Amino acid sequence: SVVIVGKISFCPKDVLGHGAEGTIVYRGMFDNRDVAVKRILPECFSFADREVQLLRESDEHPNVIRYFCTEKDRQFQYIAIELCAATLQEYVEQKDFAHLGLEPITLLQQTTSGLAHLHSLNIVHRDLKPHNILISMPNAHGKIKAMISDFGLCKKLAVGRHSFSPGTEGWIAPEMLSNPTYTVDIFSAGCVFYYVISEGSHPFGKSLQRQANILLGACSLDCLHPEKHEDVIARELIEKMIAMDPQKRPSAKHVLKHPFFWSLEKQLQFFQDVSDRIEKESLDGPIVKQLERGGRAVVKMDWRENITVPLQTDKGGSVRDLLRAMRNKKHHYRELPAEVRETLGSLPDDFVCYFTSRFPHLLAHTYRAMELCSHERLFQPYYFH
């Protein structure tokens, strides 16, 4: 036997999962299309009506679950939505999906892109978590993508930028408990970022302590190494995203421009663009002095003695001179000997990594220092102005 509420139809045996409110997701069909059917209860009819409407307005984005139809009977309301592979919670909690060869930073780009679309439409999610972030079915070209999904707890803003004081514990922003705004979704995103990166951990600890810890601002990003470039860049972003002060949190569009998302080519191109921007530039200059404000430690006192034996043969405590050296070796790469291009190359991937491995604070330091040129035409692909 099957449930038929035309054009929506599902077999009650095929249950994908649940929803804490009493809602249950099934595998079903709408208009000869394989869909996921959500069976919401009469008490929750308000949520579904908000949900269906906000989806009608935003499902055209690729990182937002496609909504199909809504049909009511004498007992329930049914929502036909896009059928996906699994949730982000199942993806992270089961390392079988690893064979799918999905890129963690790309799922997060897709999730942030989906969220950034919502925010632009003046929609705050208020319930962003791994259960609601879904992993699509592979298309004809084998591509899989992340999507936003539980639209029940959303709120559309208007003239002003304020929400009033609600969700699922462990992922709620501190201000929603204690005015709240789009930055509530940035906090929940920050937690989701660390959870995928750490392959299961959460900044605020174990599932039951998490919300009590958010209230106390007691967190840990200890899966991130202080001297591993990949982890260092990741920490920078996550720390700002999970800030106890909403004012200190970056916007969705700010998050998408962060080096965390940059390719190895982009990472190297940024080092070219900055070292090209410096000179002609005097030390007394507010750009040079801001960049020199620090390492020393970033450059590990002398950036020459920690470099490879064949490269050192080809000031020694300057980030400005280290980046100038990098520019000179990148430019004159094919007009350089085989011995030095073997230990450094191949350009661009293995080239930039040679310095990011040996100096894990170089990109993180240069990026937040060079934030002074955030308005410049040259630095538009690096910051959000």
List, by residue number, the catalytic residues.
127
CA dihedral 106, 204, 189, 164 (to 10 degrees): 170
83 annotated to bind ligand: yes
Residues 247 and 171: their CA atoms lie apart, in Å, by 19
Task: Answer yes or no whether residue 77 interacts with ligand 4L5 by CB under 6 A.
Answer: no
* Shortest CB 134 distance to ligand 4L5, Å: 5
132 annotated to bind ligand: yes
Closer residue to ligand 4L5 (CB): 16 or 264: 16
Report H helices in the chain.
Answer: 45-58, 88-93, 104-120, 183-197, 210-216, 229-241, 252-257, 264-277, 286-292, 309-313, 319-331, 338-344, 349-358, 362-369
* Shortest CB 84 distance to ligand 4L5, Å: 4
Q: How many residues bind ligand 4L5 (CB under 6 A)?
A: 17
Task: Answer yes or no whether residue 52 interacts with ligand 4L5 by CB under 6 A.
Answer: no
360 annotated to bind ligand: no
24 annotated to bind ligand: yes
150 annotated to bind ligand: yes
Residues 325 and 306: their CA atoms lie apart, in Å, by 15
The 155-194 site mask, x for binding ligand 4L5 (CB under 6 A), equals ----------------------------------------
* Shortest CB 203 distance to ligand 4L5, Å: 22
Residues 324 and 135: their CA atoms lie apart, in Å, by 43
Candidates 5, 8, 38, 322; binder of ligand 4L5 (CB under 6 A) is: 38
Q: Name residues contacting ligand 4L5, limited to 117-146 (CB under 6 A).
A: 131-132, 134
DSSP SS3 for 46 = helix
Candidates 58, 63, 111, 149; binder of ligand 4L5 (CB under 6 A) is: 149
Both tokens assigned to 51: 């949900």
Q: For tokens 């990949």, name the residue.
A: 230
- Residues contributing to the site for ligand 4L5 (CB under 6 A): 16-17, 19, 25, 36, 38, 65, 81, 83-84, 86-87, 131-132, 134, 149-150
